[PDB]
Structure 1
Amino acid sequence: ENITDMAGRSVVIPAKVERILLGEGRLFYAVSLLEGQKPFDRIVGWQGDFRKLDTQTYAVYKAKFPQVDNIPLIGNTTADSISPEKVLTLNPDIAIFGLSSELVKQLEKAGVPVVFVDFRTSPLKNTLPSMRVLGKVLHREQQANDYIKFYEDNVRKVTEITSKIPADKKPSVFIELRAGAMEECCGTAGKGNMGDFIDQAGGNNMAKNLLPGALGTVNLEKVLSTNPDIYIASGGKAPDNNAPGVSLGAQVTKEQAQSSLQTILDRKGINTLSAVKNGRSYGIWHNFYNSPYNVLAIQSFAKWFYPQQFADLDPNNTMNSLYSQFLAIEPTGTYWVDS
């Protein structure tokens, strides 16, 4: 009847859930795992981050489910169709938020149950507990628990190997989040976020000691001085976009991915790293930084870090299984890339 969310708040599970508000649109990644062939049927509103910041995934859904464009966008901008203060008109049974608000207050003041999850700041600790909570409060425990089993299995395949690797034998690693996005450079993950995936994949994240939190910045000069064994760039850029950025996602091929990475690797400063010269330079889909599908990032990283140990591991296969079992769309495009 009650469950504890990732804020440690006790929440009363509603007996009927037909109407789900997503405080962050990209929480749809999690919800989608639960809704089988009816992904949108219970979504009554969402913030626009999925539609606006994941145009590629949105577009694939829109192809098969045009109704996605009718889902109200909650926010205060001209791109939004319903302001926080009026979200009660949507009659949500429950509202889902990330840990990372006037909206939350408005919903709590209306007696709407609010559940906090987290795939962003501490994914290693919080991914699976988040999914468990979601299975319970959205009445999809079978789907949650099967996903939990699938994720555990697929993570173990890595960690049963990477946990036995001595630290001195581990590659040093630097991930540049949204490489080529802002003008200043080297937004990264430290004690959390994609850091967790580096850790689980047997890497040594050079930003871990440089940052107090999960997310932060390391100046290029420090990246260049440290000169890690491995360089990773995250991005989710449209393959039709000339702005610098790694093009990855549902609508990107390998060749477009490689090409856009190459532009990122050719940047002044970055092009002097040994990792770039050695070709130990890689691209990862940015939205794995806030998604329960992050098992695929862990598997990708492991393959880059220990290519021999993970010769037979194929994240594209892992992804295929995830889609087959849980999702109403087919897997397409490119979510990781090598030089």
Structure 2
Amino acid sequence: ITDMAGRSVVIPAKVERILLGEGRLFYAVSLLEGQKPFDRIVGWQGDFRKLDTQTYAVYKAKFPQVDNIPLIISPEKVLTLNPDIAIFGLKNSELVKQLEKAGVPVVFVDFRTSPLKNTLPSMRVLGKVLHREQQANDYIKFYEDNVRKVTEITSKIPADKKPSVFIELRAGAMEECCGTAGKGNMGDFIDQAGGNNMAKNLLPGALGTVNLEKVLSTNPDIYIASGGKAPDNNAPGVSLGAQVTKEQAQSSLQTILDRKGINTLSAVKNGRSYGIWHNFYNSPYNVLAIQSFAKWFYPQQFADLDPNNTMNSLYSQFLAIEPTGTYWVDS
């Protein structure tokens, strides 16, 4: 193996005990664990349980054991869990040092900073080091095919024909507005879906913030807000995920679109304004976002493309729960 930090690592002999240093790495692991999702997970960081309460609650009702997975508990205690392997994303510098001095192998994967470069390499690696190469090679082919449906068209489109796009990540509460993605993160999706991300040249990094005045002045063709907020939660933000209905999503999206300034945007007035589930920013399920983006960017060329079909297929083929809720929405 060569991991996403360029480190060389040795495939364990056996793996029955996996440590998830970033909780949302569960999403990648879920694609390899078939009907037994939590069986080999001895502990995890609590971002999956605390930030994706919706997906979690759906997993709990079919697997109540999940509440007893330890949350990364002193570092020392976690070493007692005797992990065969620890997976981390590109704060956890101490936990990593201890694990390495315990002769535990550590793998760094990535689906957040450089998703285009790394989503599939990340899956290929997890395939090998977790003894699930077929399920990985399967998801990879399924991902590639569902992305080719888009790139076959968008790869050939010249820059001057492409719509301008601004994506506001975690839109909501705009005393602090215009958090977005630049040369990476969801900008990779915009790139692949044949969009022109207005923030690509404003930002040095994958993630960052932009001034509202800069969005108003560019006045992009397309506006996207991301969110993963539960419906019953009067906090501001777009409400999407496994327990959100179409009607809850539109209602919450509309609240976001009606903020001072944002509501004057041409893209808002022309109804080229959309919502995407935030967690696609760190997940190999991101193919769904790429497809949602293409469909928004070029509605007719992708008229028959339905991300809901791809999602139902992904769940059918790889997961152990039923798809529910709303992961994207239109004005």
TM range (shorter): over 0.9
| Distance in 1 between residues matched to 2:219 and 2:263, nearest whole Å | 11
Q: In the alignment, what sits opposite 2:85?
A: 94
Q: In the alignment, what sits opposite 1:78?
A: none
| Distance in 1 between residues matched to 2:65 and 2:148, nearest whole Å | 38
CA distance 1:181–1:124, change in 2 (3 Å): farther
| Distance in 2 between residues matched to 1:235 and 1:276, nearest whole Å | 17
Q: What SS does the aligned partner of 1:153 have? A: helix
| Distance in 1 between residues matched to 2:285 and 2:165, nearest whole Å | 21
| Distance in 1 between residues matched to 2:234 and 2:302, nearest whole Å | 34
Which stretch shows the higher mean deviation, 122-131 or 85-94?
85-94
Q: Which whole-Å deviations, capped at 9, do the CAs of 1:225-262 have from their partners, x for residues lacking one?
A: 11100000000000111111100000001110000000
Q: Which whole-Å deviations, capped at 9, do the CAs of 1:144-173 have from their partners, x for residues lacking one?
A: 000000000000000000111121111000
Q: What SS does the aligned partner of 2:187 have? A: helix
Which stretch shows the higher mean deviation, 218-227 or 119-128?
218-227
Q: Structure 1 length as normaliser, TM-score?
A: 0.96
| Distance in 2 between residues matched to 1:181 and 1:147, nearest whole Å | 37
Runs of 4+ in structure 1 over 6 Å off: none
CA distance 1:328–1:182, change in 2 (3 Å): farther
| Distance in 1 between residues matched to 2:76 and 2:16, nearest whole Å | 21
Q: Which whole-Å deviations, capped at 9, do the CAs of 1:38-77 have from their partners, x for residues lacking one?
A: 0000000000000000000000000100000000001xxx
| Distance in 1 between residues matched to 2:312 and 2:173, nearest whole Å | 30
Q: In the alignment, what sits opposite 1:13?
A: 11
Q: In the alignment, what sits opposite 2:281?
A: 289
Unpaired runs of 5+ residues, structure 1, are: 75-81
Q: What SS does the aligned partner of 1:12 have? A: coil
| Distance in 2 between residues matched to 1:84 and 1:18, nearest whole Å | 20
Alignment of 1:113-152 (within 5 A): 113-152=105-144
| Distance in 1 between residues matched to 2:306 and 2:124, nearest whole Å | 26
Q: Which whole-Å deviations, capped at 9, do the CAs of 1:179-199 have from their partners, x for residues lacking one?
A: 005731111000000000000
Residue 103 of structure 1 deviates from its aligned partner by 1.3
| Distance in 2 between residues matched to 1:290 and 1:243, nearest whole Å | 22
Which stretch shows the higher mean deviation, 164-173 or 42-51?
164-173
Match of 2:231 among 221, 236, 239: 239
Which stretch shows the higher mean deviation, 291-300 or 105-114?
105-114
Unpaired runs of 5+ residues, structure 2, are: none
CA distance 1:130–1:254, change in 2 (3 Å): same
CA distance 1:116–1:181, change in 2 (3 Å): farther
Q: Structure 2 length as normaliser, TM-score?
A: 0.98
Q: Which whole-Å deviations, capped at 9, do the CAs of 1:5-34 have from their partners, x for residues lacking one?
A: 000100000010000000000000000000
| Distance in 2 between residues matched to 1:85 and 1:208, nearest whole Å | 42
Q: Which whole-Å deviations, capped at 9, do the CAs of 1:197-246 have from their partners, x for residues lacking one?
A: 00000000000000001000101111111110000000000011111110
Which stretch shows the higher mean deviation, 20-29 or 99-108?
99-108
Which stretch shows the higher mean deviation, 245-254 or 104-113?
104-113
Residue 102 of structure 1 deviates from its aligned partner by 1.1
Identity of aligned residues (%): 100
| Distance in 2 between residues matched to 1:245 and 1:320, nearest whole Å | 26
Q: What SS does the aligned partner of 1:34 have? A: coil
| Distance in 2 between residues matched to 1:47 and 1:286, nearest whole Å | 19
Which stretch shows the higher mean deviation, 224-233 or 181-190?
181-190
CA distance 1:16–1:146, change in 2 (3 Å): same
CA distance 1:200–1:63, change in 2 (3 Å): same
Residue 131 of structure 1 deviates from its aligned partner by 0.1
Q: What SS does the aligned partner of 1:183 have? A: helix
| Distance in 2 between residues matched to 1:277 and 1:266, nearest whole Å | 10
Q: What SS does the aligned partner of 2:36 have? A: coil
CA distance 1:181–1:130, change in 2 (3 Å): farther
